[PDB]
Design a protein around this ligand. Structure first.
Ligand code: ZN
Lengths: 151, 16
């Protein structure tokens, strides 16, 4: 059994990574320039785009790539580090609003996680929560089109 | 320090 999303961890932080098109992508504000661990020693990032808060390593063992969305839908679903699924209506290129706002804590540690269209295909990487007084109502995400061009 | 993988999520729920 292989997973598309890996729960990754730094000394100071913990967050998600998502494998798409054979690359393990996650947020720069979590990974920095770090190598990813492997049973043969550290592996250096394949891509680094600080402009877009995006980095990628080669996809690790135990992983399986997501397919990029191509149906344009606006009904998204964010998957959290707890495997919770959260419906998110899309507003713009990198913005989406939670159909049911949640405490900020509920999304904590999930940046790097996937935003799925109705077909389970990747629309973007969860970048950051948009909060009013501890209540997340929307999210920013790195559109998967950015991933595809960054390659 | 390296980013380490501490768990995996399978989107389809596929059992081992
Ligand atoms: Zn789609």
């Amino acid at each position: 059994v292989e997973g598309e999303v890996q729960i990754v961890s730094t000394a100071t932080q913990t967050f998600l990574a998502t494998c798409i098109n054979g690359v393990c992508w996650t947020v720069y504000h979590g990974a920095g320039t770090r190598t990813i661990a492997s049973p043969k020693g550290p592996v250096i990032q394949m891509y680094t785009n600080v402009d877009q808060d995006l980095v990628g390593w080669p996809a690790p063992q135990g992983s399986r790539s997501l397919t990029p969305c191509t149906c344009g839908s606006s009904d998204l679903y964010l998957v959290t580090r707890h495997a919770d699924v959260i419906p998110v209506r899309r507003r713009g290129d990198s913005r989406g609003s939670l159909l049911s706002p949640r405490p900020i804590s509920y999304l904590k540690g999930s940046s790097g996680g996937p935003l799925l269209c109705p077909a389970g295909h990747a629309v973007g990487l969860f970048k950051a929560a948009v909060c009013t007084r501890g209540v997340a109502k929307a999210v920013d995400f790195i559109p998967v089109e950015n991933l595809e061009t960054t390659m | 320090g390296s980013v380490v993988i501490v768990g995996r999520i399978v989107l389809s729920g596929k059992p081992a």
